């Protein structure tokens, strides 16, 4: 997270750290005791599918303070319309092997109703993004959401570029000072509305980190609520990677 403050331990309890064989892979989002929402692109390289770990209650990656809870990833579900090398449909649903125990430090983020999100959450000006990118603390940030037509108009044009699609949205700053970044991939874009926080976006992609005249592009979760709710009731499967169809 470029230009952000530290998220005071406890104030971001839905944050997930994803490990493969100890190596830092991505950030994720907790939505209930058993399911995690991260970016599909985090799993492009993955060879050793059986060594994935989701870490929760994590704050400082340099000291185990006890609150940390680690669970094996039993499953990675991805839409059939996501294809590596293309930024679209950048969302992944992750089942855990055994549930996590909810504490003062491990709380799920609300997953809103499609309509509620599109009608209300889409127009909350600012939302917090977070991620890790001696003292390796969780970093948070307050980005303003922009609708696609503005985002394009405010963005600096390039010859070769992906469209911002109906499954993306731009939040952030043009002046080159504040932005989420590659290491935050899959992390929450959390939106407060009247006393409760809701997941609205996933750190998806951007043009570098905090480059002038560029915004961070996020996966538009409102598109996937029915797709996620349905899959969370689905029976456990053999194998880790599942490519569920979208829609």
């Amino acid at each position: 997270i470029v230009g952000g403050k530290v998220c005071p331990k406890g104030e971001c309890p839905w944050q997930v750290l994803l490990l493969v064989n100890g190596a830092q892979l991505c950030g994720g989002t907790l939505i209930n005791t058993i399911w995690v929402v991260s970016a599909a692109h985090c799993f492009d390289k993955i060879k050793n599918w059986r060594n994935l770990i989701a870490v929760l209650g994590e704050h400082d990656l340099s000291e185990h303070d006890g609150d940390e809870q680690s669970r094996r990833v039993a499953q990675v579900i991805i839409p059939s319309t996501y294809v590596p090398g293309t930024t679209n449909h950048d969302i992944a649903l992750l089942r855990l092997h055994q549930p996590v125990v909810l504490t003062d430090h491990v709380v799920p983020l609300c997953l809103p109703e499609r309509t509620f999100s599109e009608r209300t959450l889409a127009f909350v000006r600012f939302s917090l993004v977070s991620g890790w990118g001696t003292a390796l603390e969780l970093m948070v940030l307050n980005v303003p959401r922009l609708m696609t037509q503005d985002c394009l108009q405010q963005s600096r044009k390039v010859g070769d570029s992906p469209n911002i699609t109906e499954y993306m949205f731009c939040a952030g700053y043009s002046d080159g000072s504040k932005d989420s970044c590659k290491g935050d991939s899959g992390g929450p874009h959390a939106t407060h509305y009247r006393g409760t926080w809701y997941l609205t976006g996933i750190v998806s992609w951007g043009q570098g980190c905090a480059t002038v005249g560029h915004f961070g592009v996020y996966t538009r979760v409102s598109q996937y609520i029915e797709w996620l709710q349905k899959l969370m009731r689905s029976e456990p499967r053999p194998g880790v990677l599942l490519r569920a169809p979208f829609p």
Binding site: D104, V107, L109, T196
Partner: peptide, 16 residues
């Protein structure tokens, strides 16, 4: 208005 029917409802930060 809504009210939690659980100890840790989503989107609420305990320590705050």
């Amino acid at each position: 208005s809504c009210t939690p029917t659980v100890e840790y409802p989503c989107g609420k930060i305990p320590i705050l």
